[PDB]
């Protein structure tokens, strides 16, 4: 409602770097807010795409940002009569970024890995890797839970059980308030998808450079399955955390699996031991239900609510015709131990091929009325197809079904404006939570500052 679309702030990265593909707010040890931006096609030392991360200090005028440097060199370790190899070419560093406390986690989901042993090998595959930084101290750590040292023959003999070779760890990421990093790995267990969790503190204290294959004992990975409903489900394409079991000592996981059960799609809520508490099934095959997930209490009852995006949902129209527009689903959490019912609200896009619901950002309480609000991105929506972000205000019954405000992309065609969103942080310290919108196709990020309400809705 009260985001200012007149005076924006623009940050920009190098051309072709996909700056803005992922972003997050970052607070330093003094509570000063900055913006961390992933640029997954930033050039590296060998003039080859490797990805990069930028840490943007808040400035009303925006501009260029300093790099957050990570080791971009391929590594080789000859140990235990084996050769361990990391491959960082086209790894997509910055394809996801997240901030927790004074730590930044930037992941390279397509970093490759191989183990050589005489004439045999593990196979050069995208296990993924995440890079951890404490910018103020310069500390660096890595986390790559799907690296193994098993040879190809063994996986074949065992019918590819517990095959983590194609995890793409860090595809999606989130950090619990207690500091547990939770990585989505949609390619884990031969494209079933897995989750990898470990405390940030333990990642740092157990990492040393050059080891390549080390133990993080407090880590916890999800489980394999023989059930074909999970095959090629990309469980972990998106991840989120929240409180859904009423016990405040446990943290619950929200996992998106947009191709679950032959592309029907699903979203699952789990406890920290990966036991399934709820499953929300998609409504329409290939709609990519679970592409994006969001957790926030929208109706002010203290209980977290779930939002699910299905950006390829095809809406039914006259004369038995379908129109791909995208859809968002709202599930209000019921009082006490009960199942999430049918959706409380359906939000459906209007622009053909707009992909409404590709990203969903909690905004906090934007208009300061007592109910939390959300922003939904249609990265190719709007009457011009340039991209659009729509704000929906919370209310006692859930959300308003019509948007209170629409942000039209200030960028040219193809910018994918909205593909990444983050809100609920006051970056200029004016008392209102603000919104950052990435447009990786234009290699830019737009900052929308919230201002006092003109008059309320």
């Amino acid at each position, epitope marked *: 409602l009260n985001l200012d679309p007149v005076q924006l702030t623009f940050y920009a990265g190098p051309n072709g770097s996909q700056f803005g593909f992922s972003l997050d707010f970052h607070k330093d040890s003094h509570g000063r807010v900055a913006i961390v931006v992933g640029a997954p096609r930033t050039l590296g030392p060998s003039q080859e795409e490797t990805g990069g991360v930028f840490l943007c200090p808040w400035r009303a005028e925006g501009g260029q940002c300093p790099s957050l440097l990570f080791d971009l060199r391929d590594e080789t*370790r000859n*140990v*235990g009569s084996q050769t361990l190899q990391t491959f960082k070419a086209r790894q997509g560093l910055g394809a996801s970024v997240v901030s927790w406390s004074d730590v930044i986690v930037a992941c390279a989901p397509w970093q490759h890995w191989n183990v050589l042993e005489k004439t045999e090998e593990a196979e050069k595959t995208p296990v993924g890797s995440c890079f951890l930084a404490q910018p103020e101290s310069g500390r660096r750590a890595e986390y790559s839970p799907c690296r193994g040292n098993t040879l190809s023959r063994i996986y074949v003999e065992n019918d590819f059980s517990w095959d983590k070779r194609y995890c793409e760890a860090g595809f999606s990421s989130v950090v619990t308030q207690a500091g547990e990093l939770v990585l989505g790995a949609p390619g884990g267990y031969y494209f079933l998808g897995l989750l990898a969790q470990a405390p940030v503190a333990d990642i740092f204290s157990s990492y*040393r450079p*050059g080891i390549l*294959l*080390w*133990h993080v*004992s407090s880590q916890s990975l999800s489980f394999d399955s023989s059930n074909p409903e999970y095959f090629d489900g990309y469980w972990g394409y998106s991840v989120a955390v929240g409180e859904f079991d009423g016990d405040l000592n446990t943290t619950e996981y929200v996992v998106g699996a947009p191709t679950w059960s032959w592309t029907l799609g699903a979203v699952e809520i789990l406890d920290s031991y990966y036991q399934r508490l709820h499953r929300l099934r998609g409504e329409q095959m290939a709609s990519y239900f679970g592409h994006s997930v969001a957790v926030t209490d929208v109706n002010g009852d203290g209980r977290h609510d779930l939002l699910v995006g299905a950006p390829l949902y095809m809406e039914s129209r006259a004369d038995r015709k379908l129109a791909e527009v995208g859809r968002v689903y709202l599930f209000l959490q019921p009082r006490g131990p009960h199942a999430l019912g049918a959706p409380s609200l359906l939000l459906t896009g209007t622009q053909l091929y707009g992909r409404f619901g590709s990203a969903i950002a909690p905004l906090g309480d934007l208009d300061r009325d007592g109910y939390n609000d959300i922003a939904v991105a249609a990265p190719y929506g709007g009457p011009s197809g340039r991209g659009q972000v729509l704000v929906f205000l919370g209310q006692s019954e859930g959300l308003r079904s019509r948007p209170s405000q629409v942000l039209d992309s200030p960028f040219p065609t193809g910018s994918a404006f909205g593909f990444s969103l983050r809100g609920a942080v006051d970056i200029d310290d004016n008392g209102y939570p603000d919104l950052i919108v990435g447009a990786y196709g234009a290699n830019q990020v737009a900052v929308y500052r919230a201002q006092p309400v003109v008059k309320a809705s």
Partner: antibody
Framework: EVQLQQSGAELVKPGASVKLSCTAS????????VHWVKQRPEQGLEWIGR????????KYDPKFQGKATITADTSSNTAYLQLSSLTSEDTAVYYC????????????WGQGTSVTVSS | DILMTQSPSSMSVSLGDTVSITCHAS??????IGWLQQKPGKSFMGLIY???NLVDGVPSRFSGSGSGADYSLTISSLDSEDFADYYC?????????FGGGTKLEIKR
């Protein structure tokens, strides 16, 4: 806290067999490689072999092929070292080892199990 | 098999001294070396892994160095407990192999 608790001292006769145990305390035996090392005063320290208790795959020094058989039971969180056709030169202290962080390192050691082979 | 020549077999030193134990391998092992301590009549304790990294809980007066085929364990300002046996172990190749050892003895 990681602790590797090994079985009590053994006193056996030549030609017989013995099975030493190494039970994990404060951690899951399935987490890391588990090695077995032999120590004698003159001959020093010799690496016998290792096992991955998660899957049972083993590796040995060819010197110990035939005499040493390393197994593991994740249910009881224990790793074993079976020695067969015992001789006087099998009289030694035997340690089970696991790494801290580096997959291939040798950092945590059990207290050792003394083996004495005599008629 | 990789031969580990550890030198010296023994040394008679005093409290507060800064001593160094070397280990020479028959071929390159690129820091894939560990250092071990065995106090008299007791079991082993890890000191160093991967050439330079202190095992959790080891005092910083211990430090490892070296590259290629030559490495060193250095104890700065010896303590009373530091008088014990020390061994190196390579894990660059299977089978793992150990050094002959080094016993730190009190000088008088």
């Amino acid at each position: 806290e990681v602790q590797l608790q090994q079985s009590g001292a053994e006193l056996v006769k030549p030609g017989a067999s013995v099975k030493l145990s190494c039970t994990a305390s404060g951690f899951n035996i399935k987490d890391t490689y588990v090695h077995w090392v032999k120590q004698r005063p003159e001959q020093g320290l010799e690496w016998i072999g290792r096992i991955d208790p998660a899957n049972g795959y083993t590796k040995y020094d060819p010197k110990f092929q035939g005499k040493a058989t390393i197994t593991a039971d994740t249910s009881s969180n224990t790793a074993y070292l079976q020695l067969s056709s015992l001789t006087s030169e099998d009289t030694a202290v035997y340690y089970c080892v696991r790494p801290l962080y580096d997959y291939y390192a040798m950092d945590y050691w059990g207290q050792g199990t003394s083996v004495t082979v005599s008629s | 098999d990789i031969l580990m020549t550890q030198s010296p077999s023994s040394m008679s030193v005093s409290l507060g001294d800064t001593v160094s134990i070397t280990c020479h391998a028959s071929q390159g092992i690129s820091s894939n070396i560990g250092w071990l301590q065995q106090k008299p009549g007791k079991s082993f304790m890890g000191l160093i892994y991967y050439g330079t990294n202190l095992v959790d809980g080891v005092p910083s007066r211990f430090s490892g160095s070296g590259s290629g085929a030559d490495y060193s364990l250095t104890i700065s300002s010896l303590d009373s407990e530091d008088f014990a046996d020390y061994y190196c172990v390579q894990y660059a190749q299977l089978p793992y192999t150990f050094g002959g050892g080094t016993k730190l003895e009190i000088k008088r």
